[PDB]
């Protein structure tokens, strides 16, 4: 199953291509200024089966929660409503979001204790690293 290493609180240390990953995702010029503002905090929680996401900043919170394999109805940051699956591939948490004949990934992975997220939308890839508590 997933490894406990994933959860916790995490903060945003680095990220890399993510206003061309924001524009491929179709998101506003304001919105995208604010967004590459942004410096998130992330907790990763679980309760049963039960797998919740939380992303918190001053611009904008989420929230997700998930069983492994079985799609649920999300509302993304940027207020796309999509068809969203997470799945569990070699320690990789791999999240999946269609909309509108659409689709982004977004995988989750840690190294060297770091979480690495990839985000990749239309072959735009952006990478954000984040650091436990
Ligand atoms: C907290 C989310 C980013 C900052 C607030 C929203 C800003 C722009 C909305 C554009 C869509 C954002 C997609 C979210 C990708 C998050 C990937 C990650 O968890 O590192």
Redesign the pocket.
């Known amino acids: 199953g997933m490894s406990n290493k994933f959860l916790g609180t995490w903060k945003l240390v680095s990220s890399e291509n993510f206003d061309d990953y ?1 524009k491929a ?1 179709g ?1 506003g010029l304001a ?2 200024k ?2 590459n503002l ?1 410096k ?1 905090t ?1 907790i990763n929680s679980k309760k049963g089966d039960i797998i919740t996401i939380r ?1 918190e ?1 001053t ?2 919170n ?1 929230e997700i929660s998930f069983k492994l394999g079985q799609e649920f109805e999300e509302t ?3 207020n796309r409503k999509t068809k969203s699956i997470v799945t569990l591939q070699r320690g990789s948490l791999n999240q999946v979001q269609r909309w509108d004949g659409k689709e982004t990934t ?1 995988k989750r992975k840690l190294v060297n204790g770091k979480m690495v ?1 990839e ?1 990749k939308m239309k072959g735009v890839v952006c990478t ?1 690293i984040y650091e436990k508590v």
Do not use: E, N
Request: charged share 20%; with cysteine.
């Open positions: 924001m995702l998101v919105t995208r604010l967004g942004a998130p992330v992303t900043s611009f904008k989420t993304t940051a940027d977004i997220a985000c954000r």
